[PDB]
Design a binder for this molecule. Structure first.
Ligand SMILES: *C(=O)C[C@@H]1O[C@@H](C)[C@@H](O)[C@@H](O)[C@@H]1O
Ligand SMILES: *C(=O)C[C@@H]1O[C@@H](C)[C@@H](O)[C@@H](O)[C@@H]1O
Ligand SMILES: *C(=O)C[C@@H]1O[C@@H](C)[C@@H](O)[C@@H](O)[C@@H]1O
Ligand SMILES: *C(=O)C[C@@H]1O[C@@H](C)[C@@H](O)[C@@H](O)[C@@H]1O
Ligand SMILES: [Ca+2]
Ligand SMILES: [Ca+2]
Ligand SMILES: [Ca+2]
Ligand SMILES: [Ca+2]
Ligand SMILES: [Ca+2]
Ligand SMILES: [Ca+2]
Ligand SMILES: [Ca+2]
Ligand SMILES: [Ca+2]
Lengths: 114, 8, 114, 114, 114
């Protein structure tokens, strides 16, 4: 199944933050309606924050996370969780290698903000 | 098909 | 029900990261086996990452998140989610007022690292 | 925080299924737009299904689960999870006593159907 | 990533319940320790409970859900969620065709029981 794709409420601000846990340099692209809205890059094996930004889901609401390591797309796992019918998390893990820890880039999207 | 349930 | 308490596997490194979305100054305390392991604070209505840290769950694996505003504990909501039977997120929202957006401090814990 | 309340898409069918795990007779009420749409009562310590039904979210989309035992409201915990940006689960646990297993009545809401 | 495999605590009873939403007949097999422990089959487009059973996770705790339609494996999506650090749900969706509703068989595993 498709992973890393989330339908947010249209025209809504959201936060996106990425962490790295890999020997490979992670490139995280956050797309809004298939256009790159933020790009984070960095390397860490200690969960360093490699980027954080506030974006808007825009007129379509469509948000996608893509992760690559030196031009090779990583495999993604994802889900959305809603707490108290209000607080939303869209969560992504990714795998660039063979150990299947799925933490090589970890991406957290949260809304609403403010 | 149709009327007897034939299909998937 | 109790919220903001999570049992991690023992002696496991994990990330903890806090975001602020409120006019009130947030204070986030992270306790590992009932000892204060991290304290973050800040004030943002735009999802500032007021703290991020790598901790170790220690001998018991007990992790507790507390949130307060100028000494007033916020009401917490939380859950843990596991993707592909391996990638873990422990999630906390909190409410310091009356609008019930539950985003006033948001805390994400993630493991494994590395 | 409020628990057991979920906003579904309007005019959408959903499944609701209740399981019992307690010495006490569980009564599960499902409200749609603040009106009772289904009620299930039964007793089991072996996860028996005490009710399962297809309901409509109606023009409002507001769904609330309440649980009581011998007339006393149980404490609820809940969350919603979305898989592959499509498949929705609204989950409720409840506690009628002191052991805090939160399984005394368990309610699973799923959509879409069909 | 692998889907439909979950590590439960050892020697723990759990419930497993399957729903169908498809024109195709669903076959759900539930494996514990790599042995088939329950099997359900049926056709519904209205969320019928095609089976529910109580199983023991045994010494391994390894539980796998497989879904097929006339022998063809469906594509699975899955996650595990924990409420109040105690109440566990392992969730599976499956897709037997091309519309990607992922509800064609839905499987919910819950523990603890009793
Ligand atoms: C490359 O060595 C593999 C890569 O980096 C490792 C240190 C580890 O984080 C692994 O999960 C990742 O795929
Ligand atoms: C006022 O202090 C309330 C407070 O700050 C608002 C800007 C908003 O974030 C609200 O959710 C928060 O409780
Ligand atoms: C005891 O009566 C309390 C009650 O029933 C038990 C068998 C157990 O299921 C417990 O969780 C429930 O609260
Ligand atoms: C076969 O026609 C497709 C199949 O059954 C449909 C009624 C619908 O439930 C679809 O999601 C499923 O894949
Ligand atoms: Ca890896
Ligand atoms: Ca890694
Ligand atoms: Ca608030
Ligand atoms: Ca707020
Ligand atoms: Ca109980
Ligand atoms: Ca019980
Ligand atoms: Ca389908
Ligand atoms: Ca279907």
């Amino acid at each position: 199944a498709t992973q890393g794709v989330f339908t947010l409420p249209a025209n809504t601000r959201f936060g996106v933050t990425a962490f790295a846990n890999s020997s490979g340099t992670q490139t995280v692209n956050v797309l809004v309606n298939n256009e790159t809205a933020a790009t984070f890059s960095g390397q860490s094996t200690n969960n360093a924050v490699i980027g954080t930004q506030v974006l808007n889901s825009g007129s379509s609401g469509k948000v996608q996370v893509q992760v690559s390591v030196n031009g090779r797309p990583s495999d993604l796992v994802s889900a959305q969780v809603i707490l108290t019918n209000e607080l939303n998390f869209a969560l992504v893990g990714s795998e660039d290698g063979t150990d299947n820890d799925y933490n090589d880039a970890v991406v957290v999207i949260n809304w609403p903000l403010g | 098909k149709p009327x007897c349930x034939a299909x998937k």
